[PDB]
Each structure stands twice: as structure tokens, then as C-alpha cells.
Amino acid sequence: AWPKVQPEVNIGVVGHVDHGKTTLVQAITGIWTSKHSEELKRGMTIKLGYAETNIGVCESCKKPEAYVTEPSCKSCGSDDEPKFLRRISFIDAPGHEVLMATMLSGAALMDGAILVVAANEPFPQPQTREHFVALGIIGVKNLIIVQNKVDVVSKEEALSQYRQIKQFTKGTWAENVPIIPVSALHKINIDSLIEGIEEYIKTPYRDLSQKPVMLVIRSFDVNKPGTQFNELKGGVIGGSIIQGLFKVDQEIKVLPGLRVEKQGKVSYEPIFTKISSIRFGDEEFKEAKPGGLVAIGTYLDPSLTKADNLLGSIITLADAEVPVLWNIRIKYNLLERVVGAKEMLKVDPIRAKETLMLSVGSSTTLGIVTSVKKDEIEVELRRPVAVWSNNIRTVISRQIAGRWRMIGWGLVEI
Amino acid sequence: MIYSRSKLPSEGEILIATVKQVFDYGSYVSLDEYGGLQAFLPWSEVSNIRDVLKENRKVIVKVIRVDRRKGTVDVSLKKVTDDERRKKNLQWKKIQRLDKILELVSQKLKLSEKDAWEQVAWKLEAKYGDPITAIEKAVKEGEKILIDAGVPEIWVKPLLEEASRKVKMSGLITVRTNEPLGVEKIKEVISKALENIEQDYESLLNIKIYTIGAPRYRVDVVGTNPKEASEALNQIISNLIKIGKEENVDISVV
């Protein structure tokens, strides 16, 4: 029987509306990423979800149907137990435009990407540009392109869109991102899809040397309605680890965490605690290694953490130090066109006192600029962001008709 | 039901009665005073009226005639004034709430009414006030009030219980915490609070403390005594407060 190994790789599942995204993660895992009632009741992706699975290959059978993700080989007709490789998970993003910023969080976490295109929508849909440039600003050039729902669209139209998207590949960072045809519901060609994730998207070389940082994405009060005071568990903060690792009873701080009132003005309080639990899905590990969202509950009160309060915050070692600056400088190079836009106008350069949106790792902010230079800016924020490295990948947007569409790429010089 | 200490009502004293029947030359009324005595209200002593001489109305009547030889009485509904009926109806309301508490406790403890009102009404009558007060003070300073009057502890706690074999009463408490062991410390304020209530406020049945929001919680006081509910509710939320307000935990009730 098959070992119990935490995921060592994340993959971004991004794409536009109705493309077959959540159904793709169902095709790979067997489970969906709609977890808040509104997500089902509206039938569209609003927030980022989670899903997990393994990978085993039958050394005897041919490719690729034997590439099944359970301790079995029966789909290729073999009796042998396949060779295990890993446990693989994903970041299921939205397609909507008022909801784009969210997936940007996940863009800083994924170690891969499977990007979908609609055979059954007019191509290129506007927001597809915004996903592609999201991957390009964050810089995960490792991409597997797929055309979806092929059961209603004929094989010639599939070929025409395949030529369109083979073209979409050439001329950019993605000259050789491949196209492997699958359908997310009927479980077709998903074996070749797993083979594609494997071959073309390998987990990076890990750096277990830098200060272990945990990038918050979600959090919950697991204390159920009716929880009496005897069995009170701490509030879980879930994310993914990128550099370092976490252990049982590690002394940490949540940064920034809470707001408190300080010195006649506003400020934040660094949230100190001891690590009490670290979960990967439905398996209990005592250590957390990089690759895949890692949920850590601690000795913190879940009132501070329930309902995605701290969204995107960072957490580091309680003997660490990170620059927390209320007003941050940015080297920003502006996009050449507005990518998710139905009609791509020009970029109107950013003038003083304007309002702009930032996503730093997973944390988000609104800000107004105070000193406008051509490439360098110093922007005053409504909350200081935690900049754990030099020139971190922030993603920046200006508001268009009520939809904050991106305007450039920025670097915080600390 | 009301059981008193004497046979026939006083001479000239005013009281209340429940009109049982009416015949052509008088009426049968039932005085709730001495086990429900049957008095003959004559039409010479009476006086819209269809509502005061009803089938089962409680009226305020005054006793004029008494006969200890045969043991009969003659009362009057008219010979009440307005400056008597007020205080007499007020005492009647006290005695009716007392009927409530004692009949409900004797219906719980499978006891009867006779011995009941011999132990409550008249062993507490040495204490000034209508016995409604004789437990209204038993609930504020301590249960030893009923012990002081000389009654056995067979109405004391059980009649203390039933009034106003389990009862549901609760509240909602709002808690914030900032410590590094904030969860251990909220369990600490809880498991320093719910300690030694059962001795200051005596034997009850069940208490529980749980959550209804993320910072908005719920505490239980469910025992034989709702007439001890708030006493066992309020201060105990306080025994969280009093301990929260020394362990860096903000604790209050909604």
C-alpha cells in the first residue's frame, strides 16, 4: 500500500467563464472547488478553491490510460500496483473580471499551470489576455494550454482553434506551450493531461535554506455552531509554503494580522503564537514542506481569522524581521494594452493622487500616489504590506468602468 | 386552591369569592379563603350585572353574618368599598401567584394542597408580607431566608425551584482575546469562572458555555430553578468577566 506524501507541487488552473475549470480539477481529482454557498448558487467561480490527488504509473502498460491517480491499474488491464510519483493539487481561479485580482494571489503560489481556452466561445475572449499576462507578470512561463468541452464542437473547428492557439503560443515567452485536447466532464484524454503536467511541468529545485515563510490565503474558525468550551481548537490559516518549512510547536508571528488603535493613530499588531496543527487535505503530517497549500492551526483565536479576514497576510518565524512600510516605492513598467478588455484602449499614464490596486503575493491593497516619477513611484497605502524579499512581484490595476484592470508590473525596492 | 388556618371568615372582613350558582332568592358564591367556603349572597345585599353575576366569575365580597354552631356564613358583594377592595384584590393577586407556585411545586413533588399550605402560608406568615415576598427575599440574599422562617427544607429548595423538572434559560456573551495562547486562555477564563457557583448558589442541574458567532458566544443556566435563572445567569457571565478582566481577555454579555 501507497505512502502518504504531502503535495510537493501546485498547479494553477486558470481560464475564462464556463471553460471547464472546476470540472477540469474534478477530472484530475474527482472533487470540485465551489465551497461557499454563493459559488454554487451562482454557478460561477468567485473565490479560489482546493483539491488533491496522487499519481501512479503502471510500468508494464502502454501510455497513457494506465496513468491513473489511485492505487490501481485496472484501466489498463494490469494487476500491478503502479509506481508512485507524488501527490498533486491545484489553484482553481475565477473567470470573472471583478474577481480577477483573487487568482493573482494564487499566481504567486503555483509551481505550474494548466490554462484553458474555449472552443465554444469567440476567441480570444478578452479576459484570456489578463490570465496570460498574470502568468507573465508573476513569471510562471511553464504552461499547458488545453481546448475544452470538445464534445459539442467538431474536430475541424477544434483544429481551427488549435491553429489559433498554436499561434497564440508563438512570439512570446510561450513559444512551445503545448495543446492536449481534453473535456473536463466526460473524463476524456485526462490521462494524457496528467502525462503533460508531469513531463512539461516539473516541481522546481527547492530551497530549504531561506527563512520559512507561510503565505496566507484562507482561514477558518473550525469551532462549529454549538461548540462547547471543552474541545476548542485554534483558528486555521491555510496557504502554501514556497521557501522553508514548518514544524510542530514552531514559534511564529502573523504579519500584519490584527488592527489595533495605537498612539492617537491607526496601526497594526504583530500576532504571536505557537503552531498546533499542520494539515494537508485529509492526511496528518507533523512537518510542512513546500508544494501545495498547507493549513496550519495554532494557539490563536479564530475570531481574528474566520471568514478570510487576514486575506493574503504573511507569517514568519518569531525570531525574524520583515520590512513593514505604510508607504512603498515601486518600479512599474506599464502594460501595452488593457488585457482583459473587450475594447483594448491605450493605457492612460498614472497621474498624481490617483487610486490604484496592488496584489502582493496574496495580500491586496488600495493606494494613492504621493510622488510621481516616470519609472519610480512612492505610494501611500491604507495598510502596510509585508515585503519579505527584494522587488517582490506585486500586480497592479487601475479601475475601468468599475472593473480594476491591470496597468503594469511593479517592484518594491527595500 | 388555598388552604388557610381557620374555619369561618372574620366578622366584617372583606375578601374575594368565586360565584358558583344563582337561584331565584339568592346566590351560591365560593370564597377562595377557607378551602372554598359556600356563602349565600342574598339579593337583599346586592346592588352589566350579567358580567358580575356570571357563571364562574371571581368577585369581591364582604362577610357580615357568621354562625359557629352549624358552621355557616352570609356574605355581601355590595358592602365592599373602594378603599378596601383595592388592597384586598392586591393581596388576592399575591395569594394567586402563591397558588401558582405552591400548586406547581406540589404537582411536581407529588404532594397535596392541605399540608402544603400548612407548611408555606402559615409557617411563613410569621414573616411579614404576603408569602410571595417570603420567597421574593429568599431569592435575593440567600436561600437561608426560607430556613429562617422555620419551614423544613422540603418546600425550601423545591418550591424555590419551580416558580418562574428542568427549565431552559441562557444568554449570549461576546469575547475577544489577543494573547499568544488565546485559546488556552479563553478556556482559562472559562475554567476559572465556572468554579464554586454550586456552593454560593446551591444545588442546580446543568450549565454549558458555547458559541453562536465567531466572537459571539452562548452560556447556559438550565436547572430546576428558573426563579434562580438570572442569579445563576448574570453573575456567572460576570465570573467570566471578573476573570477575563484579569487575564487579558475581554469578556461581557451581549
Add this chain to the structure above:
RNA sequence: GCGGGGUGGAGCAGCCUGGUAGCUCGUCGGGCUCAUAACCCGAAGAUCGUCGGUUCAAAUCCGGCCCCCGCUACCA
């Protein structure tokens, strides 16, 4: 936790304290006025969500159930 609303064209009364299904805007007819609005009078309209128990006898005491629901959230 499981519980509530079950009733004229409607809006809700109306329980425990059992024998008029109750009052109001509406509906058609008649009065008053030179004529219209307001005001007075008369009839028509659910016959209580439904089986069942209590009950001489039930919106009225409640249970079984059919419908509408209803205070409520991913539980690493």
C-alpha cells in the same frame, strides 16, 4: 434544535377560558345631493392545509401526515 404559517379578493384578528369562522380596505345594490367625492344601510363572498384522537359537542386541545416555509453556514 427541528419548529412555525397553514382560514372570503384580500390583511390579520379569533386559542389557553370549546356551541356565531370576527373587525377593516375591497365587491355589487340602495340611500343622501342639482350631480360627483366623503358619510349611512343591506346582501355575496373562506366554511379554518388535511387524516385522526379528545370532546355530547372544536380555527378554539393536540398528535400523524401534504404544502409553504423558517430563525442558520466548507466544519483545517
